[PDB]
Scaffold this active site. Sequence first.
Site, mmCIF file in Angstrom:
data_model
loop_
_atom_site.group_PDB
_atom_site.id
_atom_site.type_symbol
_atom_site.label_atom_id
_atom_site.label_comp_id
_atom_site.label_asym_id
_atom_site.label_seq_id
_atom_site.Cartn_x
_atom_site.Cartn_y
_atom_site.Cartn_z
ATOM 1 N N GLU A 33 0.812 -1.214 0.000
ATOM 2 C CA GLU A 33 0.000 0.000 0.000
ATOM 3 C C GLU A 33 0.851 1.272 0.000
ATOM 4 O O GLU A 33 0.817 2.084 0.930
ATOM 5 C CB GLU A 33 -1.001 -0.043 1.162
ATOM 6 N N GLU A 93 -4.246 -10.352 -0.427
ATOM 7 C CA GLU A 93 -5.221 -10.209 0.659
ATOM 8 C C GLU A 93 -6.616 -10.468 0.108
ATOM 9 O O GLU A 93 -6.960 -9.946 -0.946
ATOM 10 C CB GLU A 93 -5.172 -8.799 1.264
ATOM 11 N N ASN A 125 -8.551 7.368 15.973
ATOM 12 C CA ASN A 125 -8.357 5.920 15.953
ATOM 13 C C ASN A 125 -9.354 5.255 15.015
ATOM 14 O O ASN A 125 -10.344 5.871 14.626
ATOM 15 C CB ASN A 125 -8.477 5.336 17.374
#
Lengths: 210, 211
Positions: free
Chosen positions: B69, B145, B205
Amino acid sequence: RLAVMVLRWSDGSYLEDQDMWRMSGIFRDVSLLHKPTTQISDFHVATRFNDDFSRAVLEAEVQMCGELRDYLRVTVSLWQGETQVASGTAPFGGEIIDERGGYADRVTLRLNVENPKLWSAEIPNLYRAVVELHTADGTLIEAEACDVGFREVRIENGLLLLNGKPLLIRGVNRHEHHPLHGQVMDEQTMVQDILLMKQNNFNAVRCSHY
Amino acid sequence: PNHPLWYTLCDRYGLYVVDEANIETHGMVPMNRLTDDPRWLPAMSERVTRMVQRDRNHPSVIIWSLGNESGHGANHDALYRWIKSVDPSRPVQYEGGGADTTATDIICPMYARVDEDQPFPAVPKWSIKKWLSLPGETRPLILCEYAHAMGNSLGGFAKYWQAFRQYPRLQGGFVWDWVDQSLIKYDENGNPWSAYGGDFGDTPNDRQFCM
Ligand SMILES: [Mg+2]
Ligand code: NA
Ligand code: NA
């Protein structure tokens, strides 16, 4: 008086095992054709394009039979309706091809065509090519002709391309069949088929299997 | 790159390993801003070259990865070729920039679906069946993935395996992922509980996305 003895079965039948009615006879047209002694015996038309299809070269190979003569000429002219778009004239005698020379009985004409109207199933743009066999000072021996569609068919990078665009074939197989006339085809039926196919979003036909 | 014992254990127990360079610049805009920058080539080169120098003798390592990424930059192309030149014995893969760039020997998408196209601009995720046969495409496809196992998940996992078995060039993938990254906290009575993003006053977060 012509006498024609037609056989139903031949060694040819071993190569004619299509899934269809097995029939026999003189089931297509018979004709008589008169040609001069000095004649156009063959011609091939090819169309090549630049990358963006803004320029084309029409290339026409013409073959003759009869007596070879310095005064013989071939003119290929290209017509869009009643308008002459391009024309080329040359004496016979092809380029040298091997150690024994070239074809004295052939000539290749090359016509430039700017921004040619392209042929596809979507817009069937056609030109008319006239091939005239004639003397140097323009006495005609004979003319042949065909419809010309400027299009390029090629396979590139795993795609079948027409005029640089990947085709999507909406095709159907079509035998030559009439319920009363068997395998004799006529214009009216052919046209009826074409209209129906196009009205139903087909753009392609396979001549199954001949 | 993992703790060195990991590779010794994979050698002996028998697991195929993709060794991956410690390079991820996901949060950049655009994703390749650093990895297309020649100023960042030295720093990136060390992350790749020092991994190769460390791990190149492990038989469990069968594929090198240029990171994760970080878009696709010219720095990836340079380091791809560096690996191909020093270690011809292992393919190199990298997913960034659309999973089929010139920096990868393997079409290695993340979360590409079996039958459904997701045609994002610039970086589409083709259906994996479609991807293999795009014009000119010849490489094997292995998902780096897939099947994001977040919570009650792995719906449609069988659809992947049916396609893997039917198509020779679909040679599988790596599930995301092995183990919940939950952390342990303790209540007033000393009872442990599993915590996730935000439970430590950490902000901003991404909450439960670590599991
Ligand atoms: Mg058959
Ligand atoms: Na497979
Ligand atoms: Na996560």
